Amino acid sequence: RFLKVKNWETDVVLTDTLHLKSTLETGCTEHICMGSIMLPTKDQLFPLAKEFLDQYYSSIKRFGSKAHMDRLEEVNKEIESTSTYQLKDTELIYGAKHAWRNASRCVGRIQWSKLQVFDARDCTTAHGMFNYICNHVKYATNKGNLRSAITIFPQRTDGKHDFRVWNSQLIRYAGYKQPDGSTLGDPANVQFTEICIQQGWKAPRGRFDVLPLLLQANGNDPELFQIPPELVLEVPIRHPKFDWFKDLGLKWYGLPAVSNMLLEIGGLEFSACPFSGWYMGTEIGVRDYCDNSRYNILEEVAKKMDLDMRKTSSLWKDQALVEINIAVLYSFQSDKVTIVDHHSATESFIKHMENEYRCRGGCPADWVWIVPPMSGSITPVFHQEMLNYRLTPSFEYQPDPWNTHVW
Amino acid sequence: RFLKVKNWETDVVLTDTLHLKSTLETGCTEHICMGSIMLPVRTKDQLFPLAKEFLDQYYSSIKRFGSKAHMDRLEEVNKEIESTSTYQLKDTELIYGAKHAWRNASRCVGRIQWSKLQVFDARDCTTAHGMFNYICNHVKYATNKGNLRSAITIFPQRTDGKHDFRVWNSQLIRYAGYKQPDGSTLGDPANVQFTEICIQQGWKAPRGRFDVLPLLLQANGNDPELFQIPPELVLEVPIRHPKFDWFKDLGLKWYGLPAVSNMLLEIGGLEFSACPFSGWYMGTEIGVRDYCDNSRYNILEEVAKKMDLDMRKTSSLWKDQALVEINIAVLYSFQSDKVTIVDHHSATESFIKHMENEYRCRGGCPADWVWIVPPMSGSITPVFHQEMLNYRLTPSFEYQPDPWNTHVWKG
Numbered sequence A: 001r002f003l004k005v006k007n008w009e010t011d012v013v014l015t016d017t018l019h020l021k022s023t024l025e026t027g028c029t030e031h032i033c034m035g036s037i038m039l040p041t042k043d044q045l046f047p048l049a050k051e052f053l054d055q056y057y058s059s060i061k062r063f064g065s066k067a068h069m070d071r072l073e074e075v076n077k078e079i080e081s082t083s084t085y086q087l088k089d090t091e092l093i094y095g096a097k098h099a100w101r102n103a104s105r106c107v108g109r110i111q112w113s114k115l116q117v118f119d120a121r122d123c124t125t126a127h128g129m130f131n132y133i134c135n136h137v138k139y140a141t142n143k144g145n146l147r148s149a150i151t152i153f154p155q156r157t158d159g160k161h162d163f164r165v166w167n168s169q170l171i172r173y174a175g176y177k178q179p180d181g182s183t184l185g186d187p188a189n190v191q192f193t194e195i196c197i198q199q200g201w202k203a204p205r206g207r208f209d210v211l212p213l214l215l216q217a218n219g220n221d222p223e224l225f226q227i228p229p230e231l232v233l234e235v236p237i238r239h240p241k242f243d244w245f246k247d248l249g250l251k252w253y254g255l256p257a258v259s260n261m262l263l264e265i266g267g268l269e270f271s272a273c274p275f276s277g278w279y280m281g282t283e284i285g286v287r288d289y290c291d292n293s294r295y296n297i298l299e300e301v302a303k304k305m306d307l308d309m310r311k312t313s314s315l316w317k318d319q320a321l322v323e324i325n326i327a328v329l330y331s332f333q334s335d336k337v338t339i340v341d342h343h344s345a346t347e348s349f350i351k352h353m354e355n356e357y358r359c360r361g362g363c364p365a366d367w368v369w370i371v372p373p374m375s376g377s378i379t380p381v382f383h384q385e386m387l388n389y390r391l392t393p394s395f396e397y398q399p400d401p402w403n404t405h406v407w
Numbered sequence B: 001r002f003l004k005v006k007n008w009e010t011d012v013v014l015t016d017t018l019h020l021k022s023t024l025e026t027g028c029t030e031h032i033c034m035g036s037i038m039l040p041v042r043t044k045d046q047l048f049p050l051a052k053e054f055l056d057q058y059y060s061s062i063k064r065f066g067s068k069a070h071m072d073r074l075e076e077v078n079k080e081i082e083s084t085s086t087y088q089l090k091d092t093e094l095i096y097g098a099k100h101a102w103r104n105a106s107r108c109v110g111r112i113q114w115s116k117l118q119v120f121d122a123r124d125c126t127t128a129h130g131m132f133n134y135i136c137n138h139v140k141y142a143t144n145k146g147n148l149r150s151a152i153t154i155f156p157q158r159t160d161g162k163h164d165f166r167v168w169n170s171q172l173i174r175y176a177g178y179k180q181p182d183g184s185t186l187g188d189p190a191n192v193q194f195t196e197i198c199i200q201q202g203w204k205a206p207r208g209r210f211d212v213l214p215l216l217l218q219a220n221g222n223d224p225e226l227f228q229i230p231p232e233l234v235l236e237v238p239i240r241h242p243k244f245d246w247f248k249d250l251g252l253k254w255y256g257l258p259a260v261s262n263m264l265l266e267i268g269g270l271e272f273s274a275c276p277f278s279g280w281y282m283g284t285e286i287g288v289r290d291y292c293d294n295s296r297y298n299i300l301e302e303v304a305k306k307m308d309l310d311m312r313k314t315s316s317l318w319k320d321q322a323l324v325e326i327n328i329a330v331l332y333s334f335q336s337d338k339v340t341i342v343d344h345h346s347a348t349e350s351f352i353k354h355m356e357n358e359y360r361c362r363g364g365c366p367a368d369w370v371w372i373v374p375p376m377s378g379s380i381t382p383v384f385h386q387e388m389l390n391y392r393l394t395p396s397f398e399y400q401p402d403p404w405n406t407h408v409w410k411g
């Protein structure tokens, strides 16, 4: 019941007890593992709040204090009256940082305590949201010296007054379906691109068109806003050896800012909570560029490299894939934009694991997502056993708004 | 209950009902996933249910469920159990069991081939010399001058556990590993402990970087004995690179026949503790893991140097670049020598087809994503985007403790 995880490359063994604090469920059973599945009232609220305030006051070493019990009493009284409750600023910051800390699929969590939390709970309108989001983007970008940040909009009340950012990320490229049959720009964003147009967006129909913000405040119809171009830091992609690489006409944005997840703290639900950090190189070069359902530039690149593409066993895809990823790193580094390669990030994560087992009793980790999408076994996490379980506070998936919104 | 998996690259959705037939446990619970954990004397009491369930599956597969041959067989096994405390499989049952253990092997990406397994019945074997003979014939048959054929050789089942047949080698063909006084390792670091056991048992080691290890064979619970595979039976391939003429000078070679010999075959409650099986290599098994794992030959650095890569910072991806070239060389070498090998793109593609076929004709296919995704270029192979369900079906292959940790030495 006090479980061990072994690293098979180093024989390091860690002992996990943190998992016994786990509340939510994994989706697996004794008879079946679902480890590779993408997505597996007044009454319920108070235990949730108590559990949260319990860990909070423990973290500041005042468990079982006047302050603790008073606050416990205080929230207790408020829940019974108002049917919900509001977090103190200190708890909000703690909650957010720990949602990241607990994100078992995130390889970048060694940075978790340095998160910049922007309290936007006083926001009432989409224009207000746009302002808060522009400020977030500017702060997080920091002219290429990226800084981690989250902006937290008002918590759900009755599910009719939801604050929602309809974009999956604050900054993403448009995707257009061609009469020609294929897809121009980013195929992952074809439906959202359609909705934006369907909402009144004047699409330039280019390859890298930055999408407008679609902001929903207090449950009303969402509104289009254009992020000031000077706030959107982009990197032209070139190769340190291949001159012809520039001519592909590739660029990507510096700021990965995920905006469609739900932040849960002490039972409270923040449905609009865009958060951002900085890219691992493979996120762009392997996934964004080379997934068959994405930019899929693999053939074009290998073509330009004059590789033998007649048989798979020439490993031309693998050769090209590496070069593409060398370029992404090279480009970001050259333009002084924060980026980390998969070797560095995974090494950091192993160190982060070490720390968490040492000062917290463990670290929930989802091997399927932590191992990079290229060169897996030559990174240290491949040989690292991991335990996956769900701790709260947490980030959660939530329905796409257009499948829900009462217009 | 029905369960669905989605391939997120193609949006294809499949429905698993087979997981209902699952008996054994995964290691997971509702509150924890042990998906990436490497590993998460049976009496007549619990044996007949296991036997019955197997015979029900067997006779269903041949469309004779409920027939008189089915019921009589059940009767026959029942009496033989309560009389002898064990029982013997018919040849037909043995062959079926072994093929299905492979079919059920959720970590195996090569299962499209499962039904074409050559099964050698070595249950009449009694001594280590006899084991050596059976294994020699396996190797010759399997190797087939480079045109590899899948095969398994099955030695007598466990009785009281005091008379086990074991192959002490982890694979039938593997290179020696030698710890040097200065802390360095010569040969395959993965095989240092086994190499030392061999040397202790009287093996005279060449002490080179690619010495084929002797067979260490255990019959009927006796102390194991050393045998040397005739070198003409061991097919090897010099590794060279199609464009890098200096690659041959690295002095690398590998053997052609991957033949795993330390696992246990379970069929209808019976335990076959010695059951070496073989197929053919996926290129990455050699080029990624065997050569580039930090704990193996670890040739990444040397390859990177000769390519004159920027090894100063990791963000040059010199490791990634060197890895691809090493794996290119491995495939090139085997194909040039007409020795069966499959690249990871071809194999994962086949597996998806195998998996879809299994879902339709069988109601599922247990799969271990953690093990199925290749150790390089994961997301550009189609299994990466494929959701999978992992559960345990019998017949199966199981891990077992290394025999030198449990063996009672005779002297």
Ligand code: HEM
Pocket (backbone or CB within 6 Å): A099, A100, A103, A105, A106, A107, A108, A109, A111, A115, A148, A149, A150, A275, A276, A277, A278, A279, A280, A283, A340, A345, A369, A395
């Ligand atoms: C600062 C550098 C960061 C890096 C390098 C990083 C890296 C990654 C990577 C590579 C993934 C894999 C998912 C994918 O492939 O799309 C991921 C997932 C995730 N990240 Fe991080 N991340 C960083 C910062 C953050 C921050 C600041 C937060 C929130 C405060 C966060 C929360 C998450 C969450 C919740 C997931 C999983 C989403 C899901 O369950 O699908 N990350 N991260």
Ligand code: HEM
Pocket (backbone or CB within 6 Å): B102, B105, B107, B108, B109, B110, B111, B113, B117, B150, B151, B152, B277, B278, B279, B280, B281, B282, B285, B342, B347, B371, B397
């Ligand atoms: C014929 C071509 C075959 C290929 C290409 C193949 C490929 C693989 C690979 C790549 C693995 C992952 C193991 C690792 O990377 O260390 C694996 C696992 C496995 N294979 Fe296959 N295999 C083949 C044939 C067979 C046969 C003939 C059997 C048995 C009759 C078999 C049984 C297994 C089992 C039981 C595992 C799981 C081992 C474990 O749990 O550690 N395979 N296979």
Ligand SMILES: CN[C@H](C)Cc1cc(C#N)cc(OCc2ccc3c(C)cc(N)nc3c2)c1
Pocket (backbone or CB within 6 Å): A256, A257, A258, A260, A261, A275, A276, A277, A278, A279, A280, A283, A287, A397, A398
């Ligand atoms: C390729 N992964 C596919 C698209 C699945 C996915 C779904 C969702 C959602 N909802 C959110 C996802 O985002 C993961 C994520 C979240 C935050 C990140 C931050 C803040 C930085 C970074 N470099 N990567 C992140 C990656 C991914």
Ligand SMILES: CN[C@H](C)Cc1cc(C#N)cc(OCc2ccc3c(C)cc(N)nc3c2)c1
Pocket (backbone or CB within 6 Å): B258, B259, B260, B262, B263, B277, B278, B279, B280, B281, B282, B285, B289, B399, B400
């Ligand atoms: C790097 N993998 C580590 C050593 C774990 C492992 C353990 C065992 C055992 N026992 C057996 C293992 O082998 C898996 C396996 C089994 C049979 C194979 C066959 C028949 C062919 C092939 N190409 N690969 C195989 C791979 C692996």
Ligand SMILES: C[C@H](O)[C@H](O)[C@H]1CNc2nc(N)[nH]c(=O)c2N1
Pocket (backbone or CB within 6 Å): A008, A382, A383, A384, A385, A386, B035, B036, B037, B038, B370, B371, B372, B373
């Ligand atoms: C810790 C982790 O489970 C372990 O390193 C696994 C991961 N996946 C693997 N996958 C394959 N094919 N072979 C392996 O040996 C492993 N090792």
Ligand SMILES: C[C@H](O)[C@H](O)[C@H]1CNc2nc(N)[nH]c(=O)c2N1
Pocket (backbone or CB within 6 Å): A036, A037, A038, A368, A369, A370, B008, B384, B385, B386, B387, B388
């Ligand atoms: C099918 C599989 O669960 C799916 O492709 C997962 C696997 N691992 C991943 N890992 C990361 N980092 N990001 C992903 O989107 C995925 N997708």
Ligand SMILES: [Zn+2]
Pocket (backbone or CB within 6 Å): A028, A032, A033, A034, A035, B028, B032, B033, B034, B035
């Ligand atoms: Zn699981």
